[model samples]
Target: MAKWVCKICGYIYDEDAGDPDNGISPGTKFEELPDDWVCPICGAPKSEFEKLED
Candidate 1:
């Protein structure tokens, strides 16, 4: 599985440790999130996130 990063704020979202503060449980893939999911740091929409190549 891959992780994602917010383009606007550089907040990294690891699929292995999902954003529980946003109601996303751990082990949740970035693909499983709703389209409306926003960045907790900058409030950027999912569109502002890019696949963080690692």
Candidate 2:
């Protein structure tokens, strides 16, 4: 599991702590995210997110 960052608003999506409030369960991987999932903070599409090197 890794972390992804939104290119538009710098929102960091943590795989270990998925966006449950947005319907994503914990432990969900970045690649497992829904294609329609957007940055909860900026509304940017999933395509706008990039994997962050840990």
Candidate 3:
């Protein structure tokens, strides 16, 4: 599975967990970000997100 890293704060969105506010349930794919998803730490756009291997 791919990991998502927040560009602003480098906050990794752990797929094993869930994002209730964004309606992103557990195991949601990285490429399936909701249209309005924003970084919880810095409020950056989802477009600023990047894939992480580690």
Candidate 4:
């Protein structure tokens, strides 16, 4: 199990459930959500690490 934290915001993402609202069904790992994906109501962070991408 892996998780991602937002840079600007303090939101975390669990790979178990993706952000469908952002078109990241089942969260495909740092999910390649909306190209310009942002925090849903709050969103994904922008980074590239061992587990995080995009």
- How many times do residue backbones clash in model 4? 4
Ranking by TM-score: 2, 1, 3, 4
Q: What is the lDDT of residue 9 in candidate 4?
A: 63
On residues 1-54, what C-alpha lDDT tens digit does candidate 4 reach at each position?
A: 467766556666666777676677784666455457666655443453134445
For model 2, which pairs clash? none
TM-score of 2: 0.91
Better candidate number, 3 or 4, judged by TM-score = 3
Best by TM-score: 2
**Per-residue CA lDDT of candidate 3, range 1-54, in tens?**
567889889988877665767677888776676768888788898888887875
Which regions of candidate 3 fall more than 4 Å away from where they truly are? none
Candidate 3 TM-score, true structure as reference: 0.75
Better of 2 and 3 by lDDT: 2
Worst 10 residues of 3 by lDDT: 14-23
lDDT of each residue in 20-44, candidate 1, tens digit only: 9989999989888888888889999
lDDT of 2 by residue, 1-54 (tens): 789999999999999999999999999998888899889999999899989994
What C-alpha lDDT values do all the predictions have? 0.88, 0.92, 0.78, 0.60
Provide the lDDT at 8 for model 3.
86
**Candidate 1 TM-score versus the reference:** 0.87
lDDT of 3: 0.78
**TM-score to true structure, per model:** 0.87, 0.91, 0.75, 0.57
Worst 10 residues of 4 by lDDT: 43-52
